[PDB]
Design a protein around this motif. Structure first.
Motif, PDB file in Angstrom:
ATOM      1  N   UNK A 278     -10.421  -3.421  11.829  1.00  0.00           N
ATOM      2  CA  UNK A 278     -10.015  -2.366  10.938  1.00  0.00           C
ATOM      3  C   UNK A 278      -9.276  -1.272  11.681  1.00  0.00           C
ATOM      4  N   UNK A 279      -8.412  -0.568  10.955  1.00  0.00           N
ATOM      5  CA  UNK A 279      -7.771   0.609  11.497  1.00  0.00           C
ATOM      6  C   UNK A 279      -7.653   1.660  10.415  1.00  0.00           C
ATOM      7  N   UNK A 280      -6.414   1.970  10.045  1.00  0.00           N
ATOM      8  CA  UNK A 280      -6.127   2.896   8.960  1.00  0.00           C
ATOM      9  C   UNK A 280      -4.791   2.516   8.305  1.00  0.00           C
ATOM     10  N   UNK A 281      -4.622   2.922   7.054  1.00  0.00           N
ATOM     11  CA  UNK A 281      -3.493   2.471   6.241  1.00  0.00           C
ATOM     12  C   UNK A 281      -2.145   3.114   6.548  1.00  0.00           C
ATOM     13  N   UNK A 282      -1.097   2.318   6.421  1.00  0.00           N
ATOM     14  CA  UNK A 282       0.211   2.900   6.264  1.00  0.00           C
ATOM     15  C   UNK A 282       0.354   3.131   4.768  1.00  0.00           C
ATOM     16  N   UNK A 283       0.928   4.266   4.383  1.00  0.00           N
ATOM     17  CA  UNK A 283       1.015   4.623   2.977  1.00  0.00           C
ATOM     18  C   UNK A 283       1.555   3.539   2.049  1.00  0.00           C
ATOM     19  N   UNK A 284       2.629   2.874   2.466  1.00  0.00           N
ATOM     20  CA  UNK A 284       3.271   1.841   1.653  1.00  0.00           C
ATOM     21  C   UNK A 284       2.412   0.624   1.289  1.00  0.00           C
ATOM     22  N   UNK A 285       1.456   0.265   2.153  1.00  0.00           N
ATOM     23  CA  UNK A 285       0.562  -0.859   1.889  1.00  0.00           C
ATOM     24  C   UNK A 285      -0.177  -0.704   0.570  1.00  0.00           C
ATOM     25  N   UNK A 286      -0.632   0.520   0.307  1.00  0.00           N
ATOM     26  CA  UNK A 286      -1.221   0.896  -0.975  1.00  0.00           C
ATOM     27  C   UNK A 286      -0.140   1.167  -2.042  1.00  0.00           C
ATOM     28  N   UNK A 287       0.714   2.154  -1.787  1.00  0.00           N
ATOM     29  CA  UNK A 287       1.679   2.610  -2.776  1.00  0.00           C
ATOM     30  C   UNK A 287       2.679   1.556  -3.226  1.00  0.00           C
ATOM     31  N   UNK A 288       3.295   0.885  -2.267  1.00  0.00           N
ATOM     32  CA  UNK A 288       4.294  -0.121  -2.596  1.00  0.00           C
ATOM     33  C   UNK A 288       3.689  -1.470  -2.982  1.00  0.00           C
ATOM     34  N   UNK A 289       2.807  -1.989  -2.127  1.00  0.00           N
ATOM     35  CA  UNK A 289       2.302  -3.349  -2.290  1.00  0.00           C
ATOM     36  C   UNK A 289       1.141  -3.398  -3.288  1.00  0.00           C
ATOM     37  N   UNK A 290       0.024  -2.754  -2.952  1.00  0.00           N
ATOM     38  CA  UNK A 290      -1.170  -2.784  -3.806  1.00  0.00           C
ATOM     39  C   UNK A 290      -0.904  -2.318  -5.251  1.00  0.00           C
ATOM     40  N   UNK A 291      -0.145  -1.239  -5.424  1.00  0.00           N
ATOM     41  CA  UNK A 291       0.032  -0.644  -6.757  1.00  0.00           C
ATOM     42  C   UNK A 291       1.177  -1.204  -7.589  1.00  0.00           C
ATOM     43  N   UNK A 292       2.277  -1.580  -6.934  1.00  0.00           N
ATOM     44  CA  UNK A 292       3.534  -1.862  -7.637  1.00  0.00           C
ATOM     45  C   UNK A 292       3.991  -3.322  -7.639  1.00  0.00           C
ATOM     46  N   UNK A 293       3.399  -4.140  -6.771  1.00  0.00           N
ATOM     47  CA  UNK A 293       3.674  -5.570  -6.793  1.00  0.00           C
ATOM     48  C   UNK A 293       3.288  -6.137  -8.153  1.00  0.00           C
ATOM     49  N   UNK A 294       4.149  -6.996  -8.687  1.00  0.00           N
ATOM     50  CA  UNK A 294       3.920  -7.600  -9.991  1.00  0.00           C
ATOM     51  C   UNK A 294       2.629  -8.407 -10.029  1.00  0.00           C
ATOM     52  N   UNK A 295       2.295  -9.038  -8.908  1.00  0.00           N
ATOM     53  CA  UNK A 295       1.102  -9.865  -8.825  1.00  0.00           C
ATOM     54  C   UNK A 295      -0.123  -9.050  -8.420  1.00  0.00           C
TER      55      UNK A 295
END
Ligand code: HEM
Ligand code: HEM
Ligand SMILES: Cc1cc(N)nc2cc(-c3cncc(CN)c3)ccc12
Ligand SMILES: Cc1cc(N)nc2cc(-c3cncc(CN)c3)ccc12
Ligand SMILES: C[C@H](O)[C@H](O)[C@H]1CNc2nc(N)[nH]c(=O)c2N1
Ligand SMILES: C[C@H](O)[C@H](O)[C@H]1CNc2nc(N)[nH]c(=O)c2N1
Ligand SMILES: [Zn+2]
Lengths: 409, 411
Positions: A278-295
């Protein structure tokens, strides 16, 4: 064969000699580049040269190559292999191995922090209950009241493949996903099959949009066991926007701790099939991928609606607009709650520095352009104009099949 | 041997067999991937094999493989090569060649349009002046009052390598760049060296931030000559923003016709060192790269400032915010002026459809993920989630060194 890499934004040129020490293959050939493909029981004779390469690295790094201490160790391991058909890593070697697996992780942008890794040796673990305990201590240590710290916990190594330690979760903390009657999906679609495996194994689901999944822990090859992570250990952040007051009513939150638990740590030929890190998040991993990915959570259209953008044509770039505000909000929420997070500009700049350093001290740095370049605003981050060489060094983190396809009950 | 590629957003899986027909190399080995590296005299000894394989390809496409016409064409090319150390393409063959070169261009997201290419045969050209005239006609035809059309103009093939035709411009239409003594750059930083050459060659430079560069044209291995593209032929678009009225006051414009002129067309062993080709812009080429790359016009800050963004902390994503609005404005301006442009969402979607179609009728579609994925908003376009195989087919467009680095000057 002493390759140059060039930065087209700064004319910086670096010479790569380190690729010469490459062991494993890439899946690329002279006739085909596979650089964008997601995913391309050892014997006694297989293990000793693997052990030798690693110990050679290790004693070289402590400035003791060719020394009595080196030779004696090489002899000792060599004896143990002939006899036990495997061998055990010394604590110091275990720590070196873990730290260097991260260092070699060509798809990781955060590797500038690689040497400050906290290794938790859990090789004395024997039961899933014991695993739960090591895992809770990992989570608490790493989270650290929002001031995240990078860590890995290493469970006993593979032996015969029937006595494997596995964490069945892909991450220690993930939100559940249920397929709805009308065909839709509540929570996290990426976790649907696993979410249903937990249920199909005795989990009582709250069936909310953000239910923290339970741990499914498999010790010594036995049937895996369910454990709920004490909620007091799961640090979560409510998602609001610094300028859009309506943003909070979307009801979004994410967990603070990215903790990947389905990979295999390979050191000196030894296979650690359970090694959550474990480490810590880059913002885009949540904002771009987790939230906005169609899947996935796919909230773009819903957010764009609140902003009242022109969603009639794609050339209004309303998706892009919404995408940005969402990622502004994630960064803003985490920062407000004093939880560690890095934006994609800061992190890619960090990685460019890291590259410079590794060429300057190590003579190279394996890197996977396709994964290092952030999923938004790519070309205004420095990494985009940075040529990278991808090659496979060891020790390493490797993928491994999901347990439910392999395990026998 | 089969190969399968997967789309991780749709779970669609495709099987590539076309990669087997791959001749050239990638630059990758089993021990290294070089997929992110930007840049990875030909006697009769190797020419007729290259010829035969192309002709075999051609006559298969027209369903005449092994036919009388196929055999006799083979024999004809054979004897002409041993006799003349080279050969000439028929018109049909050249047209097929240009088309399939485009089709094989793995870094090109716009290849859905590959079948509709206007091929201009300029193989009879002998002078720079003749080149200027062919190029003007290309630009006029392609521009088409803003309703853009794909075209390519093919000048004579290399022979002994000492009589090359070259267009010294990297693009037919491009803005000058002038290094000032204070270190700053006026105009397009990308074009500073080429501008200096032009200036040296006698170009009276206006020295403005959007001066169209002179054509610098080399015929038959002769020293290059300067020609001014007539302004009425150069279609440009004032850049304004649909909500921001101060945007126009930034004084930005851009040309409508992307026409790349520095690449090399290889067909059946023959090398066409000067073969300008043009389509139309994807919006991000201009708004993301031309304007916001730190090594280009780099207007992000002046735009961000006018938007009154928090520029003191990069985590405000002010760079990201400024970038979207600029791309919004580029798209709006072109559309309002009825000049052909495509947004990166439409283009990538189109390319995925194309790509699937290519796997079904051709058995593959060579593609460079690193270049196909748009330079902004990558993962919310469908190509991001698409696995892609990169291999080299012929006919093909290749890079060549800049002519000024290899040219023997006559005086
Ligand atoms: C400390 C801050 C860190 C940041 C900001 C970071 C960032 C990232 C990012 C953005 C990715 C791309 C994967 C994706 O997009 O889902 C990635 C991949 C990866 N990270 Fe890091 N990481 C960090 C720490 C670590 C640590 C501590 C380890 C191991 C001990 C690690 C090992 C890896 C590995 C092995 C991959 C790629 C795995 C694969 O092959 O898919 N990272 N990281
Ligand atoms: C008609 C609309 C077209 C669009 C929207 C389009 C779009 C693009 C873009 C964005 C790139 C990457 C360039 C960059 O971002 O720096 C590219 C590459 C390329 N395109 Fe297209 N293109 C089009 C038509 C054509 C035509 C007509 C040809 C030739 C006849 C062509 C041949 C190529 C080649 C050879 C490359 C590779 C560039 C390189 O290797 O540097 N394309 N395309
Ligand atoms: C330590 C760490 C930190 C972080 N911020 N992101 C990671 C992302 C991954 C990662 C790599 N491949 C696939 C996935 C899909 N969940 C995730 C692994 C570790 C990470
Ligand atoms: C036909 C065509 C159309 C279009 N819209 N963009 C292109 C862009 C390129 C291209 C590729 N690499 C670098 C550059 C820099 N001039 C341009 C080549 C051809 C293009
Ligand atoms: C097919 C493609 O390789 C796949 O979508 C990759 C692309 N790059 C990525 N990059 C990061 N950082 N994370 C990812 O999950 C992916 N996915
Ligand atoms: C170093 C790296 O390969 C280089 O910056 C590439 C990356 N991808 C690209 N993609 C496109 N479309 N255009 C480019 O100029 C580049 N540049
Ligand atoms: Zn490759």
């Amino acid at each position: 064969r002493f390759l140059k890499v060039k930065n087209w934004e700064t004319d910086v040129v670096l010479t790569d000699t380190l690729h010469l020490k490459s062991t494993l293959e890439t899946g690329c050939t002279e006739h085909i580049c596979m650089g964008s493909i997601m995913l391309p029981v050892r014997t006694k004779d297989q293990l000793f040269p693997l052990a030798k390469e690693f110990l050679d690295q290790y004693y070289s790094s402590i400035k003791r190559f060719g020394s009595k201490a080196h030779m004696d160790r090489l002899e000792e391991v060599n004896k143990e292999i002939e006899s036990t058909s495997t061998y055990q890593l010394k604590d110091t070697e275990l720590i070196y191995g873990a730290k260097h697996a991260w260092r070699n992780a060509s798809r990781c942008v955060g590797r500038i922090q690689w040497s400050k890794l906290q290794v938790f040796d859990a090789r004395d673990c024997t039961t899933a209950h014991g695993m739960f305990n090591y895992i809770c201590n990992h989570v608490k240590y790493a989270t650290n009241k929002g001031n995240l710290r990078s860590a890995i916990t290493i469970f006993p190594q593979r032996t015969d493949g029937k006595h494997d330690f596995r964490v069945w979760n892909s991450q220690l903390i993930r939100y559940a996903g249920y397929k709805q009657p009308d065909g839709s999906t509540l929570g996290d679609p990426a976790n649907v099959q696993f979410t249903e495996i937990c249920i199909q194994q005795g989990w009582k689901a709250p069936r909310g949009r953000f239910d923290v999944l339970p741990l499914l822990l498999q010790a010594n090859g036995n049937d895996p066991e369910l454990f709920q992570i004490p909620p007091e250990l799961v640090l979560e952040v409510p998602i609001r926007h610094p300028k859009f007051d309506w943003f909070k009513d979307l009801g979004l939150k994410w967990y603070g701790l990215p903790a990947v638990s389905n990979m295999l740590l390979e050191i000196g030929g030894l296979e650690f099939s359970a090694c959550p890190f474990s480490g810590w998040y880059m913002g885009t991993e949540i904002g771009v991928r987790d939230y906005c990915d169609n899947s996935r959570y796919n909230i773009l259209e819903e957010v764009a609606k609140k902003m009242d953008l022109d969603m009639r044509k794609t050339s209004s770039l309303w998706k892009d607009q919404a995408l940005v505000e969402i990622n502004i909000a994630v960064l803003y929420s985490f920062q407000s709650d004093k939880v560690t997070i890095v934006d994609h500009h800061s992190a890619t700049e960090s990685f460019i520095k890291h590259m410079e350093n590794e060429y300057r001290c190590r003579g190279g740095c394996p890197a996977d352009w396709v994964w290092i370049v952030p999923p938004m605003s790519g070309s205004i981050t420095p990494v985009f104009h940075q040529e990278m060489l991808n090659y496979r060094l060891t020790p390493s983190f490797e993928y491994q099949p999901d347990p439910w396809n392999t395990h026998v009950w």
